[PDB]
């Protein structure tokens, strides 16, 4: 059943999972800061300046997820590699929901 | 120590002739070519891989293609038409073109040669980081069709970069020098240099006699490359997804990008194998896209475009007053020349002639420049 070969693939996707987790925490840090700025602590001209800074970081984050997707898309997983295929699919779908989270943010600020 | 620099429109490459051998030098990222990219941000100026990596997050402030502007007037026909391909802004200033960007709090403009000198500095530094010493002597190549304003503004970009430009040498000449075509025995040779990259196609015919070079003609297409061949495969797979799923993906930017990135990679695979497989999970509305493409099908998608490369070639021969039998050497330069069908179309137009192609086609020009830089040093 379980092949030595599939451990190579599972290891690849584990390393990609951790990268996703690290971008996801940058995304976490974006909402935590957004909130504080989205509460009129400073004048509107400078609040906008903070929101644009925040927006450029949303863009970095989106671009990092995108590069993750491009790496996953180099994988060819045999139909028998059921564990790799399920972990690849989970990861893609997860990144995509983080990407939807990023779109919520940037369409809301620095327009 | 002297280095040879290919200052390409999209990529640059640096080589050093040392220990009787050309060493093509990798940058800090381990890449033997470096993107001709400069990016202006909130806090930093990025050059090379760092600049091209953030192109999606900063399109209007990432400058590339400066080689297209260098040495030209703003009202140059070329300048106006290329400008329609660029997401950054180009401006007129006393008759000469300038690129325009927000370098943070300001809003700055650069002459194409200032951008080209940033790229040369990076190449200079790549060489110094590998050699572990100062690099100042360099040959820098230019296209055979470059005018006096174009060869000079290129030489000045070098100078500004702190380089001593020993010579400005033509790219086709440099490729010839790479294959030791100038070392040949007796009578005068006609060499066809067929240069096809990701973005430009250049045909040049030279004469070599007693090692002395002469440009006879130039031809090609300013906007032809592997970029165009990827698009034929992209449209093929968009049609396929519409067929199997009744779904139109082309307005999902992230899906089109995934697909395209996978397509240029499949394309490269197809240069050494006869089939390429693609698996993209959840490409559009959660639908997985598993597919493959044969080499013959890839060739078929691009049939007109490949065949069309032979037209510049015939124009070149006409303009040089030569018959295709009177070409003694054909040299392959540019990443796209790795495509078997292109090499076979060329192979057969010259009635089976045999091609010079053992030197990495992306690297041949820097390779010839490095040979010549050592000789000049
Ligand atoms: N890293 C890197 C890198 C180095 C050089 C290039 C220049 O290539 C210019 C064009 O050449 C095309 N090309 C190239 N380019 C060389 C190349 C090498 C490694 C790469 N790795 C990742 C992405 C692109 C790569 C291109 N190889 C081709 C091949 N084998 N068959 C058909 N076309 C090929 C590319 O698709 C481009 O359209 C592009 C990227």
What is the tally of structural domains in chain B?
4
Query: Do both B107 and B245 map to the same domain?
Result: no
B32 alpha carbon to ligand 1 midpoint, in Å? Answer: 12
3-state secondary structure of A57: helix
Which CATH number fits the domain that encloses residue B55? 3.30.420.40
What is the tally of structural domains in chain A?
1
The Cα of B332 is separated from the nearest Cα of chain A by a number of Å equal to 29
Query: Do both B338 and B294 map to the same domain?
Result: no
Which CATH number fits the domain that encloses residue B74? 3.30.30.30
CA dist., res. B291 & res. B297, Å (int): 13
Judging contacts by C-beta atoms under 8 Å, the chain A residues touching residue B42 are: 53, 56
Helix axes A82-106, A4-37, angle to 10 degrees: 10
Q: Count CB pairs under 8 A between chains A and B.
A: 44
Cβ atoms of B176 and B331 closer than 8 Å: yes
B332 alpha carbon to ligand 1 midpoint, in Å? Answer: 14
CA dist., res. B197 & res. B171, Å (int): 13
Sign of the dihedral defined by the CA atoms of residues B195, B203, B217, B359, in that order: positive
Helix axes A4-37, A44-72, angle to 10 degrees: 170
Cβ of A89 and B258 within 8 Å?
A: no
Q: Which residue of B has its CA nearest to A93?
A: B282
Backbone φ, ψ for residue A87 (5° rounding): -75, -35
Q: List the single residue in A63, A66, A92 with the smallest CB-CB distance to B282.
A: A92
Atom index in ligand 1 nearest the CA of residue B264 equals 36
Q: Could you tell me which of A23, A22, A15, A20 has the C-alpha nearest to residue A93? A: A20
CA dist., res. B333 & res. B204, Å (int): 11
Judging contacts by C-beta atoms under 8 Å, the chain B residues touching residue A99 are: 254
CA dist., res. B123 & res. B4, Å (int): 10
Q: Where are the beta strands (DSSP E) in B19-120?
A: 21-24, 34-35, 38-40, 45-47, 62-63, 89-93, 96-101, 108-110
Query: Do both B219 and B316 map to the same domain?
Result: yes
CA dist., res. A19 & res. B236, Å (int): 33
Cβ of B281 and A60 within 8 Å?
A: no
Query: Do both B157 and B278 map to the same domain?
Result: no
Residues of B annotated as binding site?
8-11, 67, 198-200, 264-271, 335-338
3-state secondary structure of B101: strand
Query: Do both B231 and B284 map to the same domain?
Result: yes
Query: Do both B142 and B20 map to the same domain?
Result: yes
Pairing state of beta strands B201-209 and B212-221?
antiparallel
Query: Do both B73 and B193 map to the same domain?
Result: no
Atom 19 (ligand 1) nearest CA: B268
Nearest-10 Cα torsion for B313, B314, B319, B323: 110
Query: Do both B327 and B293 map to the same domain?
Result: no
Cβ atoms of B22 and B175 closer than 8 Å: no
Atom 16 (ligand 1) nearest CA: B335
The Cα of A80 is separated from the nearest Cα of chain B by a number of Å equal to 15
Q: Which stretch of DSSP H or E encloses residue A64? A: helix A44-72
Sheet with B62-63, side-by-side order of all strands: B45-47, B38-40, B62-63
The Cα of A73 is separated from the nearest Cα of chain B by a number of Å equal to 5
CA dist., res. B371 & res. B161, Å (int): 21
Q: Contacts for B178-184 with beta carbons within 8 Å, 24 or more apart? A: B178/B331, B178/B359, B178/B364, B178/B365, B178/B367, B178/B368, B178/B371, B179/B329, B179/B331, B179/B356, B179/B359, B179/B364, B181/B208, B181/B329, B181/B331, B181/B356, B182/B208, B182/B211, B182/B213, B183/B211, B184/B208
Cβ atoms of B208 and B233 closer than 8 Å: no
Exposure letters B101-111 (e unless 16+ CB within 10 A, then b): bebeeeeeebb
Exposure letters A66-96 (e unless 16+ CB within 10 A, then b): bebbeebbebebeeebeebbebbbebbeebb
Backbone φ, ψ for residue B137 (5° rounding): -85, 135
Cβ of B262 and A73 within 8 Å?
A: yes
Query: Do both B23 and B129 map to the same domain?
Result: yes
> Within a 10 A sphere around the Cβ of B92, how many other Cβ atoms?
12
Q: Where are the beta strands (DSSP E) in chain B?
A: 2-7, 11-18, 21-24, 34-35, 38-40, 45-47, 62-63, 89-93, 96-101, 108-110, 137-142, 164-170, 189-196, 201-209, 212-221, 275-284, 287-294, 329-333
Residues 6+ apart with CB under 8 A from B28: B49, B126, B129
Cβ atoms of B215 and B170 closer than 8 Å: yes
B52 alpha carbon to ligand 1 midpoint, in Å? Answer: 15
Cβ of A76 and B257 within 8 Å?
A: no
Query: Do both B45 and B167 map to the same domain?
Result: yes
Nearest-10 Cα torsion for B210, B211, B214, B220: 130
Query: Do both B323 and B195 map to the same domain?
Result: yes
Longest dimension (CA), chain B: 67
> Within a 10 A sphere around the Cβ of B70, how many other Cβ atoms?
26
CA dist., res. B61 & res. B79, Å (int): 18
CA dist., res. B326 & res. B206, Å (int): 12
Domain of B59, in residue numbers: 1-63+119-183+357-377
Backbone φ, ψ for residue B60 (5° rounding): -70, -25
Cβ of B57 and A92 within 8 Å?
A: no
Q: List the single residue in B258, B279, B286 with the smallest CB-CB distance to A69.
A: B258
Q: Could you tell me which of B236, B265, B262, B274 has the C-alpha nearest to residue B335? A: B265
Query: Do both B43 and B192 map to the same domain?
Result: no
Nearest-10 Cα torsion for A66, A71, A76, A80: -80
Exposure letters B19-42 (e unless 16+ CB within 10 A, then b): eeebbbbebeeeebbbbbbbbbbe
Mutation test of ligand 1: which of B10, B268, B366 has the most ligand atoms closer than 8 Å to its C-beta? B268
Helix axes B310-319, B340-349, angle to 10 degrees: 40
Residues 6+ apart with CB under 8 A from B236: B293, B297, B301
Establish if B254 touches chain A: CB-CB under 8 angstroms.
yes
B28 alpha carbon to ligand 1 midpoint, in Å? Answer: 19
Backbone φ, ψ for residue B350 (5° rounding): -85, 45
Residues of B annotated as binding site for ADP?
10-11, 198, 264, 267, 271, 335
> Within a 10 A sphere around the Cβ of B78, how many other Cβ atoms?
12
Which CATH number fits the domain that encloses residue A72? 1.20.58.120
CA dist., res. B138 & res. B23, Å (int): 14
CA dist., res. B369 & res. B27, Å (int): 18
Domain of A28, in residue numbers: 1-111
Q: Which residues on adjacent β-strands are paired with residue B40?
A: B45
Backbone φ, ψ for residue B282 (5° rounding): 45, 55
């Amino acid at each position: 059943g379980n092949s030595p070969q599939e451990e190579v693939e599972l290891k690849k996707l584990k390393h990609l999972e951790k990268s996703v987790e690290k971008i996801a925490d940058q995304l976490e840090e974006l909402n935590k800061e957004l909130t504080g700025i989205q509460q009129g602590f400073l004048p509107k001209d400078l609040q906008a300046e903070a929101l644009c800074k925040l927006d450029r970081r949303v863009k970095a984050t989106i671009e990092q997820f995108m590069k993750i997707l491009e790496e996953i898309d180099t994988l060819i997983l045999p139909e028998n590699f059921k564990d790799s295929r399920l972990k690849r699919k989970g990861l893609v779908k997860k990144v995509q929901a983080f990407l939807a989270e990023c779109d919520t943010v940037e369409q809301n600020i620095c327009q | 120590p002297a280095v040879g620099i290919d200052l390409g429109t999209t990529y640059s490459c640096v080589g050093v002739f040392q220990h009787g051998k050309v060493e093509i030098i990798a940058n800090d990222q381990g890449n033997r070519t470096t993107p001709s990219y400069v990016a202006f941000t909130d806090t930093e100026r990025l050059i090379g891989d760092a600049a091209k990596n953030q192109v999606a997050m900063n399109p209007t402030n990432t400058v590339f293609d400066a080689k297209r502007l260098i040495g030209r007037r703003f009202d140059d026909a070329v300048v106006q038409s290329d400008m329609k391909h660029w997401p950054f802004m180009v401006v007129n200033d006393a008759g000469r073109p300038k690129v325009q960007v927000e370098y943070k709090g300001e809003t700055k403009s650069f002459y194409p040669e200032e951008v080209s000198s940033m790229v040369l500095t990076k190449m200079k530094e790549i060489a110094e980081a590998y050699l572990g010493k100062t690099v100042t002597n360099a040959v820098v190549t230019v296209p055979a069709y470059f005018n006096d304003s174009q060869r000079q503004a290129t030489k000045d970009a070098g100078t500004i970069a702190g380089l001593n430009v020993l010579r400005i040498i033509n790219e086709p000449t440099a490729a010839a020098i790479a294959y030791g075509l100038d070392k040949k025995v007796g009578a005068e040779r006609n060499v066809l240099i067929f240069d096809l990259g990701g973005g430009t196609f250049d045909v040049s015919i030279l004469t070599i006699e007693d090692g002395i070079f002469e440009v006879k003609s130039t031809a090609g297409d300013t906007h032809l490359g592997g970029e165009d061949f990827d698009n034929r495969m992209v449209n093929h797979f968009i049609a396929e997804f519409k067929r199997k799923h009744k779904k139109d993906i082309s307005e999902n930017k992230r899906a089109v990008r995934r697909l395209r990135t996978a397509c240029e990679r499949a394309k490269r695979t197809l240069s050494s194998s006869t089939q390429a497989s693609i698996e993209i999970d959840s490409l559009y509305e959660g639908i997985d896209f598993y597919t493959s493409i044969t080499r013959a099908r890839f060739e078929e998608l691009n049939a007109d475009l490949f065949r069309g490369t032979l037209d510049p070639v015939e124009k070149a021969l006409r303009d040089a007053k030569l018959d295709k039998s009177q070409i003694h050497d054909i040299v392959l330069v540019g990443g796209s020349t790795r495509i078997p069908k292109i090499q076979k179309l060329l192979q057969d137009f010259f009635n089976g002639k045999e091609l010079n192609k053992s030197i990495n086609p992306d690297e041949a020009v820097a390779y010839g420049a490095a040979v010549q830089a050592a000789i000049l040093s």
